[PDB]
Amino acid sequence: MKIVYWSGTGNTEKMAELIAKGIIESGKDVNTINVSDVNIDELLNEDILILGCSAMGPEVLEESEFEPFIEEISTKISGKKVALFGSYGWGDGKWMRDFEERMNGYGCVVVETPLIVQNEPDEAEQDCIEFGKKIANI
Template identity: 55%
Template sequence: MVKVVYWSGTGNTESMANMLAEGIKGAGNDAALFNVSDIDKDTLLEDTVFALGCPSMGNEELEEGEMEPFVESLESELSGKKVALFGSYGWGSGEWMQTWSERMTNAGAEVIGTVISNEAPTAAEEKELKELADKLVKAL
């Protein structure tokens, strides 16, 4: 099973989480979707492969009330983990995803892929999420 943990403000990142979960199921594995407020770090870190999703907020940063503290709590324990990152944005260039990916790599995780969507995910981004789902399942 692959856990998909996300925070969504407008529903775009939640849509991406659902698409990723469907892709995981289509690739022959089970997926468990969690809003970040509904899972603790120890439960997530039981697994070596998982996905995290968050939209860009403010000045191209992670949502600071729930997702940022959750990601901070994971950082010291990411060595050897394989992580996929995804999220949406409404302005800027998507720089937050590059920063987030580098942050996870610096914490010892292997980032197996990222997908970003400007606003609601398009058919092309749905395809990218399916490809990311395949990578997650293969990484198990």
Template identity: 60%
Template sequence: MNEVKIVYWSGTGNTEQMASIIADGIKEAGKEVSLINVSNANIDEILKEDLIVLGCPSMGNEELEESEMEPFVADIEKSLSGKKVALFGSYGWGSGEWMESWEERMKAAGSELVGEKGIICNEAPSGSDIDELKEFGKIIAESM
């Protein structure tokens, strides 16, 4: 795999910003990266990868976005055994339970979490969030 594909959904732009910053970290680590809105993601192409990077904000009652991201995750979930998965997303309320649930779901599907857990930001990334996201991108690149 020469290129990291980051598949994400973003409603307000916060998760899209996170994806871009993570991509910067991946590039700084010397790897190629492409950002793919989940509505444009080809499941068959994504499942060819050994490493899958997924981003989605918390929605509603701390859940994944239900019209595009949840169906995508449900479709790939059964094929994640033995793959590395990196998770990220933003939230505006709550404590990040949706990320903990998503992590457990991906582990139950047999995947290995990159960095041992997902990364979350409250609202738009700023300050130390940016450094953490870039570092997460470097960790993703090193896990290839």
């Protein structure tokens, strides 16, 4: 499987590692890829797209790298299963509510409730591992 993410300080990156750990513990292989190193064509062969990005301002996906990536794959992901996650700071998840609506609007099937964690996981580490386990059971 593959996990694609963008992280500015490392909070979403840590979540990605924990989600990967959950998938691996379930017995499956998985690679974590930063959005800047992703190959669109290879990513589209995946049964499930696991995408993460922290909340940028004002309550939007990161603009220079992550959003253009979403825009690029938007026309080629209809019918695909997707799992979404990300870290946020002072808001209450608006950027994620919008991200979920958007992916659904492109025809994707959001397989699980998006996982959002405030700042660094730390206290929520097991929740990240558990999210990976749920995805591995799909």
